[PDB]
Amino acid sequence: NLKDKILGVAKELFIKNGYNATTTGEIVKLSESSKGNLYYHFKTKENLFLEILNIEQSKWQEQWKKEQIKAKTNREKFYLYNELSLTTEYYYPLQNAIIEFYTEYYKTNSINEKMNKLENKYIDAYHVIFKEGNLNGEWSINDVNAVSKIAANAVNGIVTFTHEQNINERIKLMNKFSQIFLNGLS
Amino acid sequence: NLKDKILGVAKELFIKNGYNATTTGEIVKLSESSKGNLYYHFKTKENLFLEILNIEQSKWQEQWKKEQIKAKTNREKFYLYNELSLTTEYYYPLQNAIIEFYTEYYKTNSINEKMNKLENKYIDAYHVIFKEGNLNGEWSINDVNAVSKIAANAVNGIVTFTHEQNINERIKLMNKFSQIFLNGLS
Ligand SMILES: CN(C)c1ccc(C(=C2C=CC(=[N+](C)C)C=C2)c2ccccc2)cc1
């Protein structure tokens, strides 16, 4: 809880002032904790931040569990999952803190460890989509892991770089992509 | 030089550190110049940046033409472009900086119009490839602009978010993508 209170406050601080601007000092004081306790729990602001990210990852996964029920078939889950990825990121408060962070630890190969266990978790969502797709003859992929890393990165690119259009066009392009992609698997 | 030495240091810092990460102070101090050195041509920092992007875009689009000749069919031109995208030293090594600049200059509509031509030179390569593929009957695509953007963005994704894993693994994926994509247009 004192740990949970720190992550909560830290998350808000980041959302409000971004990664670089937030200090562990602010965090310590606002969560009514101590430099010692924050050290014992996270060691560094970077670690603190990766922990928020993990928690955030969990929530996303959980939501997806409830949300994927609106998609009977896996072809549908693929369509749905990509759209959510697009819309939900449009209004995600942490997005900017993430970007600061990511484009700040691109050089540090130390963070590359947890940073990757995290990304892998996101790819599993797709991995599951495709596997189940196989066991239902929705398509036939023999290199799932591969197709999974590809979708995850192709879709995130559309989400991250399309930024330059009206939300409708984007959902449109994204659905066109999902269409093409799922097609080239038959 | 100087007007071309600034650009040199700037590009270097933008790539290495990041957009916000580097400021008009560092650029000058590291280029053996003065603050006044910027006014007529390089007014604002965002102008100096939008500059470097134009250069790099041209340098990459040029390298591409001096190399697409190794591809007879457009089907091959598609695959190639994507692979080269992973190996170049032009434009793509700045995506991270670009992503920030778009999260700190998306409001000021002074940019959304300023570097609007930049978004076209980026999707142009695929425009030609996809259009010329129609004439050559390699495929039948009606919504070219869509596909060009979908592809341009998906690809930038595979390139930007795999920057840490084995270059061969990268090129392998990029190829399975190109494979999957084009096959979905038929
Ligand atoms: C709020 N939200 C749903 C999300 C928020 C972020 C991501 C991301 C990402 C991109 C490629 C990945 N792969 C395929 C390794 C993993 C994560 C990501 C986006 C920008 C900068 C760094 C990572 C995905 C979903």
UniProtKB/Swiss-Prot annotation, chains A, B:
Residues 1-60 form the HTH tetR-type domain. The gene is qacR. GO terms for biological process: negative regulation of DNA-templated transcription. Keywords: DNA-binding, Plasmid, Repressor, Transcription, Transcription regulation. Homodimer. Binds cooperatively to DNA as a pair of dimers. It comes from the Bacteria. InterPro entries: DNA-bd_HTH_TetR-type_CS, Homeodomain-like_sf, HTH-type_Tx_Regulator, HTH_TetR, Tet_transcr_reg_TetR-rel_C_sf, Tscrpt_reg_QacR_C. This is HTH-type transcriptional regulator QacR. Pfam families: TetR_C_5, TetR_N. Residues 23-42 bind DNA. Transcriptional repressor of qacA. Binds to IR1, an unusually long 28 bp operator, which is located downstream from the qacA promoter and overlaps its transcription start site. QacR is induced from its IR1 site by binding to one of many structurally dissimilar cationic lipophilic compounds, which are also substrates of QacA. GO terms for molecular function: DNA binding; DNA-binding transcription factor activity.
